[PDB]
């Protein structure tokens, strides 16, 4: 139950700015400046029959209109949700919401989502109050504090034991609040969230996202409370969106400070598309447009982009011994030995000549230093990546591409990504306007640029799933249930919110099906499932067809064949260039489909005009978004484009002549215009290749095949309704309401699956898992491998419970094990390594013996598990790595043993310190005192040199 | 005149 929506403007001037135009962006006032304007929205979740009194009447016992809104429910005692951009001033509410709770002589807590900015808030919090405490999962400092600044990990575990500490705790202030959606620690935050005291209230500090109520909404049910939410666009360093074209000198403002879409220099900067980052930075230097952060999404991309700044120099050289100074103070902090490392030597240069660079790849020490000199201003230009939090606002933001790279291919950028990078722009007070330049190389379509550079925030979706860790965890503590969980987890609330929307398609897809009728409904549905038994009979034929062993032989240059992509994108009839096997430089020896096995490259006709098809990797036939078939009424251009077997409709009786290079220049429209020749010689179609009579395919199975076919033609042609001149039309009528029919069916089975708890029935399966591991009796009652996998959270707690428990440790080296541990520290890919020697082998093959024995029992339990995908999960590829780290290795010689940059081997090297203190403290309770002086002995052995240097 | 038709599979 929902009230109070009223929305709310707020106007101010900024002073004029002609941007990077030769002309005024938007009419200037008669002051002489820009009236801008923004929206602050409202709205309030109420809890059933709750005395409630609206907003904008609160009196408070340079404020912006959406913080004096938040601050008066904060005054009236209620919780409230913020929603706006990163510097709209949103930590104004958490300090009123920290002041109120000091007035009235009570405690409030303070969650920071990553690492240190709870220990930078808490050294900022106490110069503001003084009162301030700070409790963390590395260091514990002071409790007795009125106010506490706290990592949101250990409220956690906190929550679990109930310290009673919320005894006169009054608010709980979570920041950053949209890191619930994380995948991999989002489940933290709804858990935390869930184990509130429905007595505490909160202020939710969250970046914009669009379903704010629903986030309020599950706040009041939970903890029966209302609960506000304040959403406001409002961007306090307005912004100015650029395109530039590549190859070309333009630059076009596509949408200005009041975000509307400038319709005709759009099509100008698109009419222009027929080196380029070198002419960006120094046209921002001349105009003194900097600092600016041209942000690559590869680590490789931007230190090849710093390389290309070989020629500039930004920094005077009383700025160039500056900053060195400050550069070599930061490198003491190391041992002399890394002093002379190689990433750290080959940085320097650019850093004098004013150019950085900033990825996840550099040494900790690197990175760090990088930072500050940039917020010094000695770097005036900034390569970075995506991955970042940090306080590195420049005035100019520049995106090298439009796209960005996926798992498997290069898709566009998203809006929300827009909104979460442009916001990096514009600097509060020094800046009067924040520019964002973006090159882009294809003649995207004006709807997909709308919906990129004025796109929409993603939602807050929750990620709430089920943990071992958790499971066992909650066994322990005898006052809440993992029933409980579920019911209250926001997962479960945004399915009961679901199905009433479900419901709404529903009975209108029903009202479609009770308006169809078919007469002779008994002969037309047979004749309608023969037909289907035909189309999958024929499609089994194709998958035969289409298999290497018989097609290859077919596949010479010229050969017509009709692609149709992913069953998606039907190109139409094609030829045959050439083919060649499939070989994945990346991770090789990967399996792949006897279809996918190889890769062919066929010249098309149908290609739409404006399909960027300069992004088409030579074997790589995942098609990049954008390249598509020529739509109805667009224009065609030739172009070859790679496919897996499985694209192929259907193979022609005809092979054309081909030249010896396809890839001269006027050779794609020599043959496009045969192509379209060989399409109007044969309007009804292509011949196909006779399976049996021109293709020799004489497997008796085979045979056995088309006969089934046979039969059900003649079959079909023996039924009533095959001479009848209504077939087309009762035929279609009948396919009509089948395909609904289905699609009724699929929802009827939809709504059931939201109509019960979620994931109620995996609840059950992993406790089965437990069980049957012997991590509690047959009657969930915890037992001592159980328990000690409650202590295990920098890895698998199955896993590595069941190694410590078989004794797999006992037999190996402290070298041996550090090596093993390394394959549960370790997640992002890297290159396959080079083959173990035995001494690393057999202890890898024993756990993956191991592995095999627990997905087995996944697999029995009902668990939707790969067995093959779960083993191969535990990266093995810097296991001679850390067994040379452990042999007395210098970190120059593992750096030239992996392609995994050094920043990341730094990392790993940290979370397996973190997982072997873990098992540390297991051994105590376990009693093994063999394993705890094996487990110390490895610790100490990576604990050393760079690894156990400190930070700034 | 453009092509040829071709029913035989080359490589046996």
């Not at chain 1, 404020?63 to 919780?79: K, V």
């Not at chain 1, 004749?527 to 998958?543: F, L, M, P, T, W």
């Not at chain 1, 300069?614 to 739509?631: D, M, Q, S, V, Y």
């Not at chain 1, 609840?763 to 328990?787: A, Q, S």
Request: aromatic share 8%; glycine share 6%; charged share 30%.
């Amino acid at each position: 139950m929902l009230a109070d929506s009223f929305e709310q403007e707020a106007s101010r001037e900024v002073d004029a700015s002609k941007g990077l135009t030769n002309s005024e962006t938007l009419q200037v006032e008669q002051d002489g400046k820009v009236r801008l304007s923004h929206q602050v929205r409202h709205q309030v979740a109420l809890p059933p029959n709750y005395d409630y009194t609206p907003i904008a009447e609160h009196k408070r016992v340079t404020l912006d209109p959406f913080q004096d809104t938040a601050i008066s429910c904060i005054d009236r005692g209620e919780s409230v949700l913020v929603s706006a951009h990163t510097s709209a001033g949103k930590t104004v509410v958490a300090e009123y919401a920290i002041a109120q709770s000091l007035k009235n002589k009570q405690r409030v807590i303070y969650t920071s989502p990553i690492k240190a900015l709870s220990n930078q808030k808490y050294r900022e919090l106490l110069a503001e109050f003084g009162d301030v405490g700070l409790m963390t999962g590395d260091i514990t400092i002071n409790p007795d504090a009125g106010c506490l600044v706290m990592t949101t990990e250990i409220l956690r575990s906190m929550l679990y034991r109930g310290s009673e500490v919320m005894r006169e705790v009054a608010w709980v202030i979570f920041d950053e609040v949209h890191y619930m959606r994380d995948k991999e620690r989002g489940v933290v935050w709804e858990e935390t969230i869930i184990l509130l005291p429905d007595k505490v209230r909160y202020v939710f500090l969250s970046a914009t996202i669009p379903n704010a109520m629903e986030f309020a909404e599950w706040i009041c049910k939970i903890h029966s409370q209302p609960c506000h939410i304040v959403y406001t666009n409002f961007r306090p360093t307005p912004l100015q969106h650029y395109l530039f074209p590549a190859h070309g000198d333009g630059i076009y403002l596509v949408v200005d400070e009041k975000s509307t879409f400038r319709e005709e220099n759009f099509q100008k900067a698109m009419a222009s598309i027929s080196g380029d980052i070198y002419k960006i930075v120094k046209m921002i230097w001349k105009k003194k447009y900097n600092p600016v952060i041209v942000f690559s999404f590869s680590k490789r991309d931007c230190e090849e982009l710093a390389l290309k700044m070989s020629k500039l120099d930004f920094n005077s050289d009383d700025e160039k011994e500056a900053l060195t100074k400050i550069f070599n103070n930061a490198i003491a902090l190391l041992p002399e030995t890394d002093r002379e490392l190689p990433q750290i030597k080959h940085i320097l240069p650019l850093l004098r000549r004013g150019i950085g660079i900033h990825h996840s790849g550099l040494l900790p020490i690197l990175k760090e230093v990088i930072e500050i000199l940039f917020q010094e201003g000695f770097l005036k230009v900034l390569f970075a990546t995506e991955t970042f939090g940090l306080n590195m606002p420049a005035k100019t933001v520049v995106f090298t591409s439009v796209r960005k790279w996926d798992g498997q291919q290069f898709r566009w950028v998203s809006g929300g990504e827009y909104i979460q990078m442009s916001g990096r722009a514009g600097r509060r007070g020094l800046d009067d306007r924040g520019i964002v330049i973006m090159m882009i190389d294809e003649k995207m379509e004006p709807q997909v640029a709308k919906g990129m550079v004025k796109g929409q925030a993603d939602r807050l979706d929750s990620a709430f799933h089920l943990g071992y860790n958790m499971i066992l965890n909650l066994m322990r503590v005898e006052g809440i249930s993992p029933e409980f969980m579920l019911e209250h987890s926001f997962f479960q609330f945004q399915n009961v919110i679901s199905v009433p929307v479900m419901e709404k398609k529903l009975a209108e897809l029903k009202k479609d099906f009770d308006g169809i009728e078919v007469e002779d409904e008994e002969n037309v549905k047979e004749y309608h499932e023969i037909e289907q038994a035909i189309k999958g009979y024929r499609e089994d034929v194709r998958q035969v067809v289409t298999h290497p062993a018989n097609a290859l032989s077919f596949l010479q240059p010229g050969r017509l064949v009709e692609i149709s992509v992913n069953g998606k994108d039907n190109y139409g009839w094609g030829a045959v260039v050439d083919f060649a096997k499939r070989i994945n430089k990346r991770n090789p020896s990967a399996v792949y489909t006897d279809h996918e096995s190889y890769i062919v490259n066929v010249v098309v006709n149908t290609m739409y005009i404006d399909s960027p098809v300069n992004l088409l990797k030579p074997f790589n036939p995942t098609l990049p978004e954008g390249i598509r078939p020529a739509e109805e009424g667009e224009k065609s251009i030739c172009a070859v484009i790679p496919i897996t077997l499985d694209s192929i409709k259907s193979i022609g009786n005809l092979r054309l002549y081909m030249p010896k290079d396809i890839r001269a220049s006027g050779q794609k429209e020599t043959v496009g215009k045969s192509l379209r020749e060989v399409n109007r010689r044969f309007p009804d179609g292509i011949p196909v290749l006779d399976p049996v009579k021109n293709m020799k395919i004489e497997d008796e199975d085979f045979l056995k095949l088309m006969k089934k076919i046979d039969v059900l033609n003649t079959k079909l042609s023996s039924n009533p309704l095959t001479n009848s001149m209504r077939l087309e039309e009762l035929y279609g009528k009948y396919s009509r309401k089948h395909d609904l029919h289905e699609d009724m069916k699929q929802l009827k089975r939809k709504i059931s699956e939201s109509q019960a708890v979620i994931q109620l029935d995996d609840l059950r399966r992993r406790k089965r898992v437990l069980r049957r591991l012997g991590f509690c009796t047959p009657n969930d009652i915890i037992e001592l491998k159980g328990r000690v996998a409650c202590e295990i959270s920098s890895g698998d707690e199955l896993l590595l419970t069941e190694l410590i428990f078989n004794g797999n440790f006992n037999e190996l080296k402290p070298e041996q094990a550090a090596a093993l541990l390394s394959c549960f520290a370790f997640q992002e890919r890297c290159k396959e390594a080079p083959r173990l020697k035995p001494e690393l082998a057999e202890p890898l093959k024993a756990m993956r013996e191991i592995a095999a024995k627990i997905a087995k029992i996944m697999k029995d339990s009902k668990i939707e598990v790969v067995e093959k995908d779960y083993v191969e999960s535990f990266r093995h590829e810097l296991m001679e790595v850390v067994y040379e780290w452990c042999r007395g290795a210098t970190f120059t010689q593992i750096c030239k043993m992996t392609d995994v940059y050094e920043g990341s081997l730094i990392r790993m090297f940290k979370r397996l310190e973190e997982l072997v203190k873990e098992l540390v403290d297991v051994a105590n309770t376990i009693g093994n005192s063999s394993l705890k002086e094996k487990m110390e002995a490895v610790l100490k052995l990576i604990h050393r040199d760079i690894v156990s240097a400190g930070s700034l | 005149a453009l092509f040829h038709v071709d029913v035989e599979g080359d490589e046996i």
